[PDB]
Amino acid sequence: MLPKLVITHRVHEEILQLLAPHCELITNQTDSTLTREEILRRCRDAQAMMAFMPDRVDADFLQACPELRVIGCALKGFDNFDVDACTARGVWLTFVPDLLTVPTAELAIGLAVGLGRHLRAADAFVRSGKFRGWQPRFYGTGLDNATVGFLGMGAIGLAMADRLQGWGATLQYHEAKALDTQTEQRLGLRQVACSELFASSDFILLALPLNADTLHLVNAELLALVRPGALLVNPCRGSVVDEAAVLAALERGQLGGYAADVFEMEDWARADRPQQIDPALLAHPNTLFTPHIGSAVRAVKLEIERCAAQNILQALAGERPINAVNRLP
Amino acid sequence: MLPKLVITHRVHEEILQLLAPHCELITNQTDSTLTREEILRRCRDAQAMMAFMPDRVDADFLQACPELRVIGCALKGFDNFDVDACTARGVWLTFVPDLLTVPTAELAIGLAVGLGRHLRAADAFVRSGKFRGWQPRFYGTGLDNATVGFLGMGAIGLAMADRLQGWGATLQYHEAKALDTQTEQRLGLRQVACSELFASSDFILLALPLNADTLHLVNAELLALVRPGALLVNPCRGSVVDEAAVLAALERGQLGGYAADVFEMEDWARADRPQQIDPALLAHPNTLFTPHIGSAVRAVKLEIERCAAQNILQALAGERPINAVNRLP
Ligand SMILES: NC(=O)c1ccc[n+]([C@@H]2O[C@H](COP(=O)([O-])OP(=O)(O)OC[C@H]3O[C@@H](n4cnc5c(N)ncnc54)[C@H](O)[C@@H]3O)[C@@H](O)[C@H]2O)c1
Ligand SMILES: NC(=O)c1ccc[n+]([C@@H]2O[C@H](COP(=O)([O-])OP(=O)(O)OC[C@H]3O[C@@H](n4cnc5c(N)ncnc54)[C@H](O)[C@@H]3O)[C@@H](O)[C@H]2O)c1
């Protein structure tokens, strides 16, 4: 008789124990992600859903789950969940606004450094047993005296700026909403126009959501403006960049490197989503890739899961979930 | 007749044009490093030597070079130069106290983050073409909430601590000489003893020089104290650790990982150094290596050459050189 909650991926033992009194659990305690079908099947008369990165919820989905009251997302960017369609069908949609920030900021910064210093080739060369003593090659680019620019200055943007405080860089940024003047002053951050951002940054760090307006914002037009050698890092969504324009920009040698933790192929809500990452991109030596491990820190997963849990519980208790993304009664 | 100066490695054109007006230069504007035998032959009657990391200067070297008045080092770690022997024969020995610090500090943080997040493997996974989007695995270790222990707290250790300022980590160190109270509380650094450092740190960042006191300091004994999963980062000298001990600790699962820019094989002065990095260590998944690129940033390399050149010039003009390592009666 208790509400039914479908949890699409493994969560911690302790999280289940927190949910179990209040709802019956349709869980997936394995490593794999299940087909769309199998998940739709489970959700038919499900009253709650814990959704993770590979899930996409559209109107067709919601349509076949008439009893849903809350979809609790263990994530920040809800771009593959049609918020409106949720609101239309009376479904609460919740996110995790803070817990993913830091491990992701930490990673973005490591990518910057990894890319600026040719960490892949350097590591491969040492491993191939060919390294036999100090040599004047592998010249790299560090952050000291570099100008670093951010596209976006929300949670992840500020966590990055914070961590770059002691590093001797000129920090500058472009965003939709300006930062208050106190914060700018504190973090040594200068508000520039988007094209100046691309024209004058030695490192470009991406920190914005994927939505209608950001889709492919970082395109050939913007990449054309960059200092030869400029370094681009994408910790957020594959589709805010045009991967092909990024590839063309590396090939001509204008853009010095592209590191990324996210890919256009992950962005389900897009009708023309690439099925894979272009092999020519994987093959380009001036790159660095991680398979969406932005928040793949063990202690954090437990918290993220819990945040999503608590939200779900509140919804099912008839309260406004503390982290709803959308608005209802 | 102009004092004769032997440069053992390629230097920037600009550095030749500063030196040549004071000295007759015996240069090596090739890509190679030269034989000990060849360098001795050149130094037979030189009054100065500009030296780099492949150079090693013992008593027999000085004995074969009676005219030598200064050896100017394009580096910070003089472990391959016998200073007392230098002092004894009236030979200044200078070095470069700051130019190398920051690029090396940036690298070490990068290796820390890189190693913690399993970056080598992550990038392999993506590049293999079988990335199918996010998964509940690959999981790693962040700096937020971790304890980070430094062994050494001079130029480099401070730069690392500087660069960790906004990172949510508890910072500790053990040095041969304590930091002053102000710098301590400015950076949030607690002094602890060596063994306690290794027992209670999630990351251990090496930041000390190579000498008889520190040779093989990081040995089986010390490594047996670490929390399982602890991460070691060596950006200073290979031989401050026992690489076989490091390997064994990795192989038994106690040490979480090892990352280094330096290796026992490069430590020329060491009669018994291994001749290569152990293939079992290069094959170990829990590592990350860079081939001594600590200061491989072009803008900086020119500066390093300039620092040594000026030091060399001051000596020949009979001043005490600003960055002397010894002092002359
Ligand atoms: N790698 C990962 O695992 C991971 C983790 C967390 C978040 N992310 C992604 O990163 C995105 C942002 O993260 P956040 O926590 O900083 O989000 P946030 O909401 O805190 O910040 C979004 C920022 O981007 C700016 N922005 C929005 N639209 C813009 C536009 N058209 N032009 C310029 N700037 C614009 C906003 O003004 C805001 O500053 C998330 O939406 C998510 O998609 C990825
Ligand atoms: N990979 C590279 O390119 C690179 C670059 C610069 C320096 N290095 C190496 O790093 C070393 C240190 O660099 P630095 O600029 O910080 O030098 P530094 O002289 O400023 O710092 C040395 C620090 O180590 C501490 N120390 C010395 N003996 C110790 C012991 N027995 N136990 C604990 N602590 C001890 C000292 O007290 C001091 O704090 C250099 O000697 C050099 O060999 C490597």
Numbering used by the authors:
A (entry chain A), B (entry chain B): 1 to 329
Sentences from the paper on this structure:
Phosphite dehydrogenase (PTDH), first discovered in Pseudomonas stutzeri WM88, catalyzes the oxidation of phosphite to phosphate, which is coupled to the reduction of NAD+ to NADH. The crystal structure of 17X-PTDH indicates that Arg301 is situated at the dimer interface, but its side chain orients inwards towards the enzyme active site.
In addition, X-ray crystal structures of R301A and R301K were obtained. Crystals were obtained that contained NAD+ and that diffracted to 2.35 Å and 2.65 Å for the R301A and R301K mutants, respectively. Unfortunately, the side chain of Lys301 exhibits poor electron density in the latter mutant indicating that the Lys does not occupy a well-defined position in the crystal. Although the R301K mutant possesses slightly higher activity than the parent enzyme, amine bases failed to affect the activity of the R301A mutant.
